[PDB]
Write a protein that binds this ligand. Structure first.
Ligand code: CUO
Ligand code: CUO
Lengths: 208, 208
């Protein structure tokens, strides 16, 4: 089905990104962080709960629902579009979690980006973000740096096996959560939390 | 010569430190950072130049002089004493650079310390410090994470060979500088700089 392939933008694995590609990304995200969209965009996922603008709030993301992949799919494009506005040359990269990784990706990991072209020292926007409403810094605590296994693959693979979409989604969603808990770990403000997770930039890569 | 061994405090390799020992250290440093001593103590090494309180300033540390090991030796105890005031149970640990290290020490490396006993999320004071006078954050850029070699050993070993103290010092000082450049790298505010280096907490461990 032709519908899956895109003409316009390409999303590549994070490792694949060239220095130039990454450089656009570093900048775009930093600018997005500066711009209004980044904080507000984060809100969509969870806190602050936007779903009911007025009245009791609820987290917006559909989870535990078959709608779930669609929602997140839309979410990623939202950020992607923001990045493009930012001037990102390429689509949000995806961190292939299934593939066993010797180490965490350099792009996310780097605390600071030298960006030699313009002498400047700045934190890597990819590395983290802050949570404006709840004044804090997002944190990550991979308890298990250990992940090197078929386990991700088995879970995903099993999901792949199902013909039924709904059967597929339930399995698919579960594997999806593994990255969140694994990266976030204990940290209250992290990937591990429903509300907080949107803040971390890894979120975008993982969802991609 | 009995003069070398101490009765009172013990300095151990960083790896050796027990979780309890490290915990005291994490706290003590954090408190020292909070206290007045930490920033001021840093000043002794370099900027701001304290040597001439009034008049043209010069960096205080003796370098390129035979006095050099003595000066730094005094410097470490100064911080150590501060730590004890802080309530540190043990002396400043030493990061045996000569030994080839698979990875950088966990104590220094950790960005944040969970410190489960008291639920709190804080940066690791060991990880870094800020430079108050020149508003900035210290940075580290090990260009070469590569260091796994006899090279450190050869240099130090050669130094060991000399009977003459002065002959010894020149060789000794040079090997000493390797850690500074290697950790600091390109970063303007880092171990690599004479003025800035004091700020990084690694400085203490290395000098130890
Ligand atoms: O699910 Cu809402 O975050 Cu991956
Ligand atoms: O020398 Cu003054 O710093 Cu190691």
């Amino acid at each position: 089905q032709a519908e899956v392939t895109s003409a316009n933008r390409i999303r590549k694995n994070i490792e694949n990104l060239s220095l130039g590609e990454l450089e656009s990304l570093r900048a775009a995200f930093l600018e997005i962080e500066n711009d209004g969209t980044y904080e507000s965009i984060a809100k969509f996922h969870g806190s602050p709960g936007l779903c009911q603008l007025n009245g009791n709030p609820i987290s917006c993301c559909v989870h535990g629902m078959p709608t779930f992949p669609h929602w997140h799919r839309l979410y990623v494009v939202v950020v992607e579009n923001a990045l493009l506005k930012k001037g990102s040359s390429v689509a949000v990269p995806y961190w292939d979690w299934t593939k066993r990784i010797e180490h965490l990706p350099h792009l996310i990991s780097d605390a600071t980006y030298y960006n030699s072209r313009q002498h400047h020292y700045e934190t890597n926007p990819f590395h983290h973000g802050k949570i404006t409403h709840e004044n804090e810094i997002t944190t990550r605590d991979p308890k298990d740096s250990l992940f090197h296994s078929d386990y991700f693959y088995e879970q995903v693979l099993y999901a792949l096996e199902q013909d039924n979409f709904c059967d597929f989604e339930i399995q698919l969603e579960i594997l999806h959560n593994a990255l969140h808990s694994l990266l976030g770990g204990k940290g209250k403000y992290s990937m591990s939390n429903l509300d907080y997770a949107a803040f971390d930039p890894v979120f975008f890569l993982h969802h991609a």
